Design a protein around this motif. Sequence first.
Motif, PDB file in Angstrom:
ATOM      1  N   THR F 118      49.030 -15.561 -54.318  1.00  0.00           N
ATOM      2  CA  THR F 118      49.076 -16.101 -52.969  1.00  0.00           C
ATOM      3  C   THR F 118      49.371 -14.970 -51.997  1.00  0.00           C
ATOM      4  N   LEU F 119      48.983 -15.184 -50.740  1.00  0.00           N
ATOM      5  CA  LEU F 119      49.144 -14.150 -49.727  1.00  0.00           C
ATOM      6  C   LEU F 119      50.608 -13.802 -49.486  1.00  0.00           C
ATOM      7  N   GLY F 120      51.528 -14.709 -49.806  1.00  0.00           N
ATOM      8  CA  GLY F 120      52.945 -14.487 -49.610  1.00  0.00           C
ATOM      9  C   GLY F 120      53.674 -13.862 -50.776  1.00  0.00           C
ATOM     10  N   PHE F 121      52.965 -13.509 -51.848  1.00  0.00           N
ATOM     11  CA  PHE F 121      53.594 -12.830 -52.975  1.00  0.00           C
ATOM     12  C   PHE F 121      53.844 -11.357 -52.664  1.00  0.00           C
ATOM     13  N   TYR F 122      52.940 -10.743 -51.900  1.00  0.00           N
ATOM     14  CA  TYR F 122      53.011  -9.306 -51.670  1.00  0.00           C
ATOM     15  C   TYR F 122      54.208  -8.922 -50.813  1.00  0.00           C
ATOM     16  N   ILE F 123      54.630  -9.786 -49.889  1.00  0.00           N
ATOM     17  CA  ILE F 123      55.777  -9.447 -49.049  1.00  0.00           C
ATOM     18  C   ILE F 123      57.031  -9.296 -49.905  1.00  0.00           C
ATOM     19  N   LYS F 124      57.266 -10.248 -50.811  1.00  0.00           N
ATOM     20  CA  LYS F 124      58.419 -10.146 -51.700  1.00  0.00           C
ATOM     21  C   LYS F 124      58.250  -9.000 -52.688  1.00  0.00           C
ATOM     22  N   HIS F 125      57.023  -8.773 -53.163  1.00  0.00           N
ATOM     23  CA  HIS F 125      56.796  -7.647 -54.063  1.00  0.00           C
ATOM     24  C   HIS F 125      57.170  -6.331 -53.390  1.00  0.00           C
ATOM     25  N   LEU F 126      56.755  -6.148 -52.137  1.00  0.00           N
ATOM     26  CA  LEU F 126      57.081  -4.925 -51.411  1.00  0.00           C
ATOM     27  C   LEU F 126      58.569  -4.843 -51.104  1.00  0.00           C
ATOM     28  N   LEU F 127      59.207  -5.982 -50.822  1.00  0.00           N
ATOM     29  CA  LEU F 127      60.647  -5.973 -50.593  1.00  0.00           C
ATOM     30  C   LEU F 127      61.384  -5.471 -51.830  1.00  0.00           C
ATOM     31  N   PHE F 128      61.013  -5.986 -53.004  1.00  0.00           N
ATOM     32  CA  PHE F 128      61.655  -5.532 -54.233  1.00  0.00           C
ATOM     33  C   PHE F 128      61.276  -4.094 -54.565  1.00  0.00           C
ATOM     34  N   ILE F 129      60.076  -3.660 -54.173  1.00  0.00           N
ATOM     35  CA  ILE F 129      59.699  -2.261 -54.353  1.00  0.00           C
ATOM     36  C   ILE F 129      60.615  -1.359 -53.539  1.00  0.00           C
TER      37      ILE F 129
END
Lengths: 230, 95, 118, 104, 199, 300, 62
Positions: F118-129
């Motif tokens: 989903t389009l909203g997975f990448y925001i959390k992925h980048l936050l954890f990155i």
Amino acid sequence: GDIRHKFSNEITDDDYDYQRAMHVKPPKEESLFQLTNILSSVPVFKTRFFLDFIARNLDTNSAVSTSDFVAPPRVHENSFFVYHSRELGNVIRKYRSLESIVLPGALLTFTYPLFAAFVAIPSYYFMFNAKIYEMSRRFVVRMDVLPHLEMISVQRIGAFGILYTKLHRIQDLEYVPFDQVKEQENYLWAIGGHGVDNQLIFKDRSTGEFFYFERQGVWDAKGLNHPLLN
Amino acid sequence: TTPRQLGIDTNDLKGFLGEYYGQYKKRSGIRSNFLGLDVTGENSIIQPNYDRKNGIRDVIDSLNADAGKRKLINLEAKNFIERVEKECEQRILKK
Amino acid sequence: GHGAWNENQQHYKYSKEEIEAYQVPMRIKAGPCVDTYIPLKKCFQENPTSFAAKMLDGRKGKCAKEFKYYNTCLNHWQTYENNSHVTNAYWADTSKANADGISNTYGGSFRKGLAWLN
Amino acid sequence: MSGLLRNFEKLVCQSQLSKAGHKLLLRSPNSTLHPTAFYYKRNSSQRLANEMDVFQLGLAAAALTRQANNYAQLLDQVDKEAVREEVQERITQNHSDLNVYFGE
Amino acid sequence: SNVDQHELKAEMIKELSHYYDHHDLSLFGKVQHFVEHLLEEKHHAKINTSNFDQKKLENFSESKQISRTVFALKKIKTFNHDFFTSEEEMILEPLPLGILTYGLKYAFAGVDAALLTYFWRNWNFNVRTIGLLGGLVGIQMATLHIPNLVNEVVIQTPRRRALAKKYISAYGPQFFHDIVNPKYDIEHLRHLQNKLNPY
Amino acid sequence: LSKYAYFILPLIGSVTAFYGGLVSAFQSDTKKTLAYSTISHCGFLMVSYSTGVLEFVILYLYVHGFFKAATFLCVGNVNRFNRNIQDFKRMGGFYKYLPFECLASFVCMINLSGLPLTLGFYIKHLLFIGLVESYTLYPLIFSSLILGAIAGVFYSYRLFYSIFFDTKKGKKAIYLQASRIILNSKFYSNTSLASNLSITFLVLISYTVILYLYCTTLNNYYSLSDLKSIYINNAYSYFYKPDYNFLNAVSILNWFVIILLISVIYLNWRWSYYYTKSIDSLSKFILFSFFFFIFSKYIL
Amino acid sequence: YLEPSYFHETFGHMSQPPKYDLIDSNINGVEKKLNKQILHREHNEHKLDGFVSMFKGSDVAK
Ligand SMILES: CCCCCCCCCCCCCCCCCC(=O)OC[C@H](COP(=O)([O-])OCC[N+](C)(C)C)OC(=O)CCCCCCCCCCCCCCCCC
Ligand SMILES: CCCCCCCCCCCCCCCCCC(=O)OC[C@H](COP(=O)([O-])OCC[N+](C)(C)C)OC(=O)CCCCCCCCCCCCCCCCC
Ligand SMILES: CCCCCCCCCCCCCCCCCC(=O)OC[C@H](COP(=O)([O-])OCC[N+](C)(C)C)OC(=O)CCCCCCCCCCCCCCCCC
Ligand SMILES: CCCCCCCCCCCCCCCCCC(=O)OC[C@H](COP(=O)([O-])OCC[N+](C)(C)C)OC(=O)CCCCCCCCCCCCCCCCC
Ligand SMILES: CCCCCCCCCCCCCCCCCC(=O)OC[C@H](COP(=O)([O-])OCC[N+](C)(C)C)OC(=O)CCCCCCCCCCCCCCCCC
Ligand SMILES: CCCCCCCCCCCCCCCCCC(=O)OC[C@H](COP(=O)(O)OCCN)OC(=O)CCCCCCCCCCCCCCCCC
Ligand SMILES: CCCCCCCCCCCCCCCC(=O)OC[C@H](COP(=O)(O)O)OC(=O)CCCCCCCCCCCCCCC
């Protein structure tokens, strides 16, 4: 009450037909691409080869139940059956059978079996153990009565789907009200106790082992009315 | 899990990290007044303190140390690859 | 040719005035790939393309010759920034890495998770 | 029930199960239909009569008697004396247990 | 005299393969990798090319010449990557697989998984079922190669032939024949420059 | 250059994220659930800013704003249909009465709540990155972040299922007043055509703008405009060339989310005619997943 | 389809469908054998060269 016919441009059932996928209505007409139409039209399926393949290679009619009365084979030459589980027992058997394929397969296939185990442990302890496993352990697959011993044989599903039968004295059986155990095992009855009967719980005083009987289980009138159990 | 390698880019030491120490080295806030007035820095409620070692100093020092450690790791890797090449060349020659 | 990953095709180093002209974001200017980035930006400016095309094109279409150098420089830059070339080697074989220390500084503190005991 | 490229000739038809008095016996794994060894307590903290019932004591006594008779047959059919000592000791232990249980 | 580059590279490969050519595999994956390494192709550092001399260019019928020029272009691309432009590199590379191929592969996987699930749940394991599973898996594996062969024989082949004709017109058959000949200097091939590449 | 900011932004952000996520998951009212989800996303935004990737912060802000607005509009339509009763304990079987709202809410919620693919997975992925690890309270910060991130699934599932596909719990009048045959017409609808068109256009434009920002920032060719900041965090290194350690670490959160999804889907809280068949379906899914993975990885 | 990163980091890298070019089939015999061996050696040397270049080039940026 309907006034759709009063206007020429109003919606029609022909226009609503597209909602039959998302809406349940009795069939009206068969489309050219339906499975039924294709099978009845294409002459290939009429071939005796295909007909015999259908007749043989599929679920057999022998296993299909033919009556509302069931007399399963006696466990002992002198015993008589009382209770038996039809569907939940099979489901539990199949679920526990996964331990013989997924587990060794997981060990031999997963790159990180330790990671898989670390994920599974808390998963088992929360939302899985009380959900299925304890209910299966306390589940009664079948119950018979041996009169010469004045005992009851209970069949249970073990690890990896193994079936084992144990004897319990009738004198050692007691009825445990659901109120005495609801608070103790709220989670178990919350998420996994729906299949078994809540108000028909029994336990063996000597061994302290419970007996859960499926709601959709078959009971024998003669077995219930036998003087040993009354 | 194990800790990750995080910190300021090793290619940008001259900058955010460079300016921070550059200010304390310059100490330009306590220079003599341009008009010759006896007033100078340290004569106001808001004044400079270039002999201070608290605040973001710890964070800046930690970032600098991490960048130095990462550079050292890269240098050690380069030395390792060079040593491996030299050893292989010597083994080939000694045959 | 035969240039280092930081140099570009023309082996030309841009001055501060040239960087200001072809203004580069500070994110890129901080790294060492300014020389390889500037030609790519110039090519994109000369041949503007839509964001959908940029996302769906795996070779950057017209601006591929400069993008090769830019991608090589970016790979080297990020690998050296995160020390991934050593971390991956230690992950692959910690015992051998300790036997012939690639970087004792990282080896002395590295500890792979117990879950990843391949 | 369900199968592919298989024949279910050996399967038991549900008609027999529906019928009463079909004379079918069930053999299942890990089935224990005899209570022998359930109430056999080698060491008792108290009198066996207090804790166990006549039924349990009779089961234990019958099991012990059968084992003792089998060991007596072993004595009869065995020759070497050294091997026979273990059989004699087991028989003595079984006899003592049988005596106490039967007295209770 | 000087240390042989091929021997040095072979020694460095033997020394450092564990780092850049090792992944995390399960027990089955490790066994399969062991089998592959047993039935592998050895990394011959030195190849004796002094036995096969050459074939006369006049022998070929100007179509085998085009095919050999295609092979020469592939060799040039493999040795030096700056010879060809993006379009020529795409032509020379295998055509990337598509949604059709991926969906076919995953549908095959899904049907196989469903069959295995059914067999395990119903305990329907026997010689006939095992043979059916084996045959279905073999047919699926054979079919998975069909899209690539179709692509190579339909799309890439005429494009590669056209590129070979263009390069023959540019250079001459003897150049690519010399390149095809294994005695061609690999260092010279690496340092070679392309007339048709603007770079 | 603020010591106080460094210490305060991550801790407060993570605590707010966890608190809001859990409260939203346990919430029963639609507007209150959205408010607590907004609090959790604000906490995540604070943590992202602490990480120090302004591009990631901007992407998170855009995604959250767009999809939160869309979900708010959908729940507003639901409440208007339900006669200002914002609690879904009186909402049930609204999928047929508000067909557009059901699917629009499905899409908006899967995008808003960080879910895989989903389009909203990448925001959390980048936050954890970009999350930093030098914090003294890093244990609490990371645990709160993980709990808040996983909390999205519960509230999304509860809101969607209870509002639309749960058993009919609302007052008889709500359904009867709209089920009258006289209302059957081409114009029949419980919402506004303008409302539906506005929601559709908002979703489309949000998707397009989010894709544009993702191309601008996360693409290999960095094309974002100057941010007028000289602080480089090095977080993009783990987005361009991640190492095996981080790649496997992200799998922990991915599988946690997977298990929670399985729980919210297959877990039975009430007796039903489909209890045994649901257990059977769970077994089928487990075994089929295992075999499918086997074939995909090894047998091809 | 275009972002399989989640699948890669959640299930691992699955078997890839075959992808190759039939250019090598143009040549036959000892020529083909020698060219194939040379190409294999070149591929291995290229991988090693990439690895060693990545390790060595740490000090390129001054
Ligand atoms: C630090 C220490 C860590 C320790 C970690 C330990 C991890 C490993 C755990 C090992 C568990 C072993 C489980 C054994 C299961 C059997 C148990 C048993 O006796 O039950 C009998 C049960 C029940 O027996 P039964 O007697 O009741 O009846 C026979 C079967 N029915 C019921 C149908 C009539 O039988 C089975 O389940 C038989 C299973 C046979 C197949 C077992 C292996 C399957 C997986 C193979 C490998 C993976 C697939 C490979 C595919 C390759 C394709 C090319
Ligand atoms: C070693 C001791 C014994 C360990 C036994 C194994 C754990 C208990 C049984 C697990 C059965 C379920 C396996 C599902 C496999 C799905 C595919 C997969 O990713 O496999 C490879 C992976 C692992 O293979 P890998 O290690 O090669 O993957 C690369 C590493 N990662 C993924 C971390 C980057 O499987 C798992 O990650 C499984 C984790 C354990 C699951 C524990 C139970 C919770 C799930 C309930 C069952 C339903 C799950 C459905 C999932 C659907 C997809 C999201
Ligand atoms: C111990 C291992 C290390 C990890 C430590 C943490 C352990 C796991 C903690 C999980 C807490 C989840 C809380 C969710 C609360 C949701 C409340 C809500 O909305 O209502 C309930 C909603 C249902 O709402 P509903 O509206 O459908 O019905 C509610 C019904 N009543 C009110 C009666 C309860 O969802 C659930 O029921 C699901 C939550 C319960 C099941 C939780 C399973 C946890 C599985 C953990 C797997 C761990 C994998 C390994 C790795 C983990 C670490 C990386
Ligand atoms: C009655 C009239 C009612 C109003 C009608 C309005 C229709 C609007 C239709 C499009 C809206 C949605 C656009 C896509 C979403 C945004 C995408 C984005 O961020 O932009 C990316 C792109 C930007 O370009 P790019 O992303 O492709 O990349 C450019 C590449 N470089 C950088 C190299 C140059 O923008 C768009 O695609 C949006 C359209 C272009 C901008 C148009 C603005 C002028 C509008 C003229 C019409 C005026 C009508 C006046 C009516 C008055 C009535 C009172
Ligand atoms: C049919 C209705 C029910 C379906 C419910 C969903 C079931 C999910 C079961 C999961 C089991 C556990 C995981 C094992 C499989 C792992 C697959 C994986 O990681 O591959 C990613 C792979 C990774 O591929 P890759 O890494 O080689 O590279 C992809 C990128 N390109 C294309 C550029 C090379 O991504 C895909 O491409 C997936 C397939 C996309 C196209 C599928 C078309 C339809 C196929 C038939 C239907 C299949 C349904 C089953 C689920 C399919 C999911 C994609
Ligand atoms: C001489 C002649 C020789 C002839 C040789 C050739 C013969 C024909 C061979 C092919 C056709 C086989 C026969 C057709 C039926 C196959 C059925 C099957 O594969 O199993 C279905 C099974 C149903 O569940 P089960 O638990 O087994 O219940 C038993 C009910 N009787 O399913 C399950 O167990 C559930 C699995 C799915 C779990 C959830 C996921 C849903 C999606 C699954 C899709 C699978 C189908 C393929 C599509 C994949 C992509 C989605
Ligand atoms: C370090 C361990 C890692 C994990 C190991 C998993 C092993 C699985 C095989 C177990 C075989 C023996 C079962 C014994 C059952 C019994 O009667 O067990 C009974 C006993 C006694 O329980 P009580 O003390 O409560 O009576 O169980 C125990 O003492 C605890 C052991 C629990 C075993 C659970 C097995 C299922 C695991 C499921 C994981 C999550 C779901 C995965 C997808 C389906």
